[PDB]
Symmetry: D2
């Protein structure tokens, strides 16, 4: 058994922690200032009362910034703490601010207000990462390296093509982030307990004061939905997936075995006895964070699944979940930007990784251009790799006489095929790795970034 009485403190430690509640103090102060003005317009508050109210709130605002706004366990949430503090410096008048207002609408409002601001910060860091990748791609556009499929060397490609693939994926995340922002800016304040505000409050005034793009259409939905939370986290999860893959790419490319890249000392750790060993601690951290964010997505969906269309304590889990995601995402984008802007590419090791064999497909494409069918062209180049293989040499060292025995279509210009530059220049069609396509990609991305305003 367990008989505590009519309180049981243990259930209090299951609610949002005070450190979390404090994060919403400012947005709750702004929301209340807007509501106060609306009340005066509805003749609930006199101009005199409004002035004492707005003054008191401003004072509390200053206290929050100084981090001296005290909150007790008895104040179960920041909304209560703020009302207590107002009564403390203004007196009874303070109680009139809650006329027709419910805690049910405060929490959703405050959370949306906080995210509107957070998305902006996230967005800023996202674009920096994209700009960093596109610009580095434009600078190292002459670098050529091996491209992979199934982590096996397939053919030569431009290192810039690799960087641009990530930039393009992150641009889609950017686009999704922008779409989510439009739905977060829908103000739910003025929905009361469930049926809406009963005092003919002017919600358009609330929207204007709070700088929101619109107001909620239905009071029941405004109070019980947490779509904005789910989307944001969902969008943040796919973004983290992208970064987890880049982290994987660089971890492999930074191995001594591959030796394509080297991380700055700022984003790695080493051993005093093994001065060559450079641990990609930063990338491993990024990769693992994809799991932390996904975990918040799974949690919130499970929380919402199957509960009635109304307000219930269940919804309380949204605060910790989103704050963790925004803080994680924010710190992660900054670290990623650092890693990419300060890493060093080893052009030497990249070329040396490009062996002649990687050009056997170009050898068949050559025949195809001479009119020969792909099937026949393929088998032809196959005999070439077999011949050189027997002659203990590479294909680029096969005389025009050796090739001539395979097919009469092999002219003198066949020597042009054995060039990593000619190889990559074949892909001029939109999206390919030719210097011209890469340049066009960089231009289109620059334009997209600009359109992120």
């Amino acid at each position: 058994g367990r008989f505590v009485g009519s309180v049981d403190p243990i259930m209090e430690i299951l609610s949002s922690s005070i450190s979390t509640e404090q994060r919403l103090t400012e947005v709750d102060i702004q929301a209340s200032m807007a509501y106060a003005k609306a009340l005066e317009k509805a003749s609930i508050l006199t101009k005199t009362e409004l002035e004492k109210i707005l003054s008191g709130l401003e004072k509390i605002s200053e206290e929050s910034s100084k981090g001296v706004l005290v909150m007790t366990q008895s104040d179960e949430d920041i909304q209560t703490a703020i009302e207590r503090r107002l009564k403390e410096l203004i007196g009874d008048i303070a109680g009139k601010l809650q006329t027709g207002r419910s805690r049910n609408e405060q929490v959703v409002t405050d959370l949306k207000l906080l995210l509107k601001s957070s998305i902006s910060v996230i967005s800023t860091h996202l674009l920096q990462l994209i700009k960093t990748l596109v610009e580095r791609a434009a600078i190292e556009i002459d670098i050529i390296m091996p491209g992979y499929t199934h982590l096996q060397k397939a053919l030569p490609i431009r290192w810039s093509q690799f960087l641009l693939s990530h930039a393009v994926a992150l641009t889609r995340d950017s686009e999704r982030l922008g779409e989510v922002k439009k739905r977060i800016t829908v103000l739910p304040l003025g929905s009361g307990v469930l049926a809406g505000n009963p005092l003919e409050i002017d919600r358009e005034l609330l929207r204007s004061e709070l700088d929101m793009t619109s107001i909620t259409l239905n009071s029941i939905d405004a109070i019980s939905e947490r779509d904005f939370v789910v989307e944001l986290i969902s969008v943040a999860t796919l973004l983290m997936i992208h970064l987890s893959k880049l982290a994987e790419d660089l971890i492999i490319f930074s191995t001594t075995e591959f030796g394509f890249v080297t991380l700055s000392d700022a984003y790695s750790t080493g051993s005093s006895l093994l001065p060559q060993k450079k641990n990609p601690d930063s990338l491993e951290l990024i990769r693992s964070k994809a799991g932390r964010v996904f975990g918040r997505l799974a949690a919130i969906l499970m929380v919402l699944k199957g509960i009635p269309s109304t307000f219930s304590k269940d919804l309380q889990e949204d605060k910790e979940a989103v704050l963790d995601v925004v803080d994680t995402l924010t710190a992660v984008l900054q670290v990623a930007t650092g890693v990419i802007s300060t890493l060093q590419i080893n052009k030497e090791n990249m070329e040396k990784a490009l062996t002649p064999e990687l050009l056997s497909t170009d050898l068949a494409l050559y025949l195809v251009r001479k009119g020969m069918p792909i099937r026949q062209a393929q088998t032809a180049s196959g005999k070439a790799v077999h011949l050189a293989e027997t002659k203990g040499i590479t294909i680029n060292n096969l005389t025009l006489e050796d090739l001539k025995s395979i097919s009469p279509l092999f002219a003198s210009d066949v020597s042009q095929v054995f060039s990593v530059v000619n190889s990559v220049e074949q892909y001029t069609a939109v999206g390919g790795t030719a210097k011209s396509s890469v340049t066009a990609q960089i231009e289109q991305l620059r334009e997209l970034l600009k359109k992120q305003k």
Copy 2:
């Protein structure tokens, strides 16, 4: 090892991509003929052959073996059986890596249209019933406890706006689905200066991928579609919970048609909400697919690998499940019967104690005082063995002299509900406004 095949995508799943893989092949062939890889003559045979295979596929007689491992290979073999050597030319500069991403997107493009239609139909149904039953008033809840009177229509409209946000999200996803990746080759792009713009046109796509590595290795469109489908299901799982509770005999607010429930001969009162329970459980099935694909993509190289293969089964399950659920949901909403009398009885006098407080507020009394006062009234009535709706004006004057003769208008479930005229409330004028706005958004979609 034969078991390797067992872990591969099932044949019944591969057959689902026959039509789109064929359309993608015809467009490609037209592009090869322009790049002079195919003669005008070769183009005709190929196109004619693909049309024949397209016909067999529609009659369900296009056979595929385990040896063909995917539908792409089965299509090529069949073309060769119909046209001969010429068929091979169709795969010049093309890669298996780009065919699958193109086929899924082409298929998904069609699927979304279907889903959207049924989504819109479900929303229109809710909006339309809301208009018809705008005068019904039931108890409103918080924590599943009666809080205050509210209009049933306000309830229906809440689910309606949530669903419109899903509708809006589906539209945004579609824009990224229609980006053509065909022409990216194996990884570095197409090596024969193919005209990707032609492909785009021949395939009714809105644009073409900017980077070949990305276009071949990304599955954002898959995870994005499933995420949207998941939130949508969460909404339906919430609607199912509401209706299951409202359809209990204890609550008795609604009754499902025989079409969406089961019963017993020995118990006529018993009407099991099978359809609702089914809908609720599908939220988990769809979520499962979301979690599956996310875990598959986490931490793997930015290129092509066999891990990607899991996408096909996962998205078809989601689209098939979503399509069926939407129709069943529309059915349930269309044929359910509401029990006005029961909604009526549930509205007890005590539920107006708050309006009694707002009455004093409008008269100038501070909100704090009003609540206390109203709390005195609710207690006075207890110590009288009567409800508050029938307290003498003398009994009220003792609480506060502000109580006038017009205080009798508060004891009306209709006057209660009519207080909420601000945008979004239960007042008739407000509910009507919501209906008009949703009715238009529907049109604009």
Copy 3:
């Protein structure tokens, strides 16, 4: 930035005591290996006992400078004993310390969870034994199906929780496998005595392979997994009581300690406690999904990914510990409303029993059901209830009916039919209570 990207200090500080305890065992083993002299061991042992003393007054600190608790313990020793403290790190790695400390912490955490789990189960069985005579409606698809004992309902949850309890016990034995002495990856290069480490730390065994011991987090995964299913069970119990506590059903009423109200609505008792419990299932599942994704597809060695295990498992233990105590309070203080349970017991609920009666009279089930259905229909048309039909009425349906059919219309006789093991008969419920008390006797 790492200021919010690294493991929090509040979590690191919780590993203080076990890290000290682990360091003391290592020191003793280092002395046996001759790396430490009898005198050096005393100095180190002495300082560590001092750091433990400080940690007993929330004194020991940390700063962003101190990446982890392992580093803070080392710093504190040095600046309290001298360079001698640096000898303690001989052949020891952080890789093995973190995985060792965590296992040491969870070992005591499981015992705490276990103690609270059993209190809940004990509370449910003892209550069932006291209210064994209460009869209420049983449901399927949330629709009334037949009469059932309320205790049978309480016991269904108690037996589910015992499977959880049993699983916690199985996880426990894999947690107490000491990984200390695995070095950076290939093991301890100083021929350290791992058996001395095990006994000092009071563990049941030691790891077999150094690579595995350093890179596996199975124990974290199965602990959270067991916790997740247990939470799924509490989420279902929460749904049941939320439904039963509505005014419409009115079977239960929560105490004021687990409910929220209002002055304007005295009849409104919000089941906050049950709503919180239900959402925590999501919270715990969230920790499961996260760790599983962190582990998926990474190389079989140490990497910074593993760092996420600490926060996730502690949130789970803290949540679980609080939730179980809250669950116990709700179950021991709630009130059942027998009057409402009885009133929900209507005659038609006995139509199935009317069929069994005929079956016992030799009639095949299929026909007995059609016969009972007719009786039901006949009662409706006459505007009465099945129990008001006359024997002549019943004989018109089947001459097999007799005067003893009147025994069928008793809610008590109805539940007393289910004497088969596990049924709702009083004798059956009594057997469940006895067996569960028996199982609870496992320490």
Copy 4:
């Protein structure tokens, strides 16, 4: 539509046999309870075996007209025995049939999975015993750290998998708990002998409470949960080998059976199989997530939600079964490249062993490390490797260096230091091999 949302035929068919057996057992209990005559029992049993031998040639057609396998079997029983078939349903419910059948099926499925898991484990240990002499670089953060025996690596996986085997065993105990005889929800009302049902079905025990037996799906969650952790382990092994079979690393080469190549790129060996194994971990995880979400927040009784358990758990058993066989084949047919592993061991990786040398000579570890650090730095400046330093050079750094310091530059000596239990020393690896062989044999 309402039906295209119900489990598929091929899924329901998987339950034909176990449903048949459960019905025979119920019939016998009925007769004993005096509901069936000694004669009627014979009719029903004979008709059930006929359907059993019928599902033998796959002659039973679910028809899709039947909502589930239980219904199909009841309809098909009447079709050849007459109205007597209907008496089989006395006091029985569909609610208890579905859970009973699922458990009966999983009891046998676990056996199959178990068989393949052990074969995999045995393959790893036996190969570890055969290639015990091969040495390779060890990694942390995917950076070379120190020399290590390749067999130490293989064994780390075998030990992880032995933990999965143990968990599989504990789950079996709870799956063999018979729920038949629980009725619709209150239990069986005809005083049927459940003990008879248990022995007739070869189960370990019977459920204690009818409400729990009907609405719980713990056995489903547990199995998938165990299967998920097992797949996580295999996803890591896939990651290891994918990196090791890379050209850049070149330590491992897969057989043609588990890889794909190119006629143009004879060097191309795509690790298709491993990539396949890595993605199934997500597939299985998805089933776990789906079921946990289906069960969360629903009442403690029977409802349609519960029907999602069938497809999920079967997809999991089929996947595990296949994946383990493929995993076994990869491990048994792969080839290691001793030259590449060997030539990857650089002298630099022994700098730590140099520090240990001094520690064994009585020098404090911290000082011992700064010393090797100077040797490491001195070697660089001179443009030579650490193993090429002369006694003279070393002795200036510290007099504790002697001529025996030359032994330190042996990858063999290096790995032979870890003689403590669980280490890479040859005698430790062998000890591990012996323990697992006995642990595998214990499986009886």
